[PDB]
Amino acid sequence: ALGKLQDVVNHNAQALNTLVKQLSSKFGAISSVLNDILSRLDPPEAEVQ
Amino acid sequence: FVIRGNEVSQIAPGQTGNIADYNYKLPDDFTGCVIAWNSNKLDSKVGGN
Asked: Cβ of B9 under 8 Å from any chain A Cβ?
């Protein structure tokens, strides 16, 4: 009966979760953690990552 | 300045090395040209320069 309102709630939380999930994406880089990239590479390639 | 043959790669922005860290440091946003040429004829001696 109350599918529409719950759907809105369902979309909003899912969107935030997806955005949060996007932080765990390498995006074609060696790591998803900035601290590891700084601690492991020189600035010419760390800047690229 | 005068350096070794193998140290010419270290005269670059963002490089980790001994002369890079403790002798001559380049900034990350460096613009310009590095010129390197062999000076065995002038800067070397048979007894050790």
From this structure: no
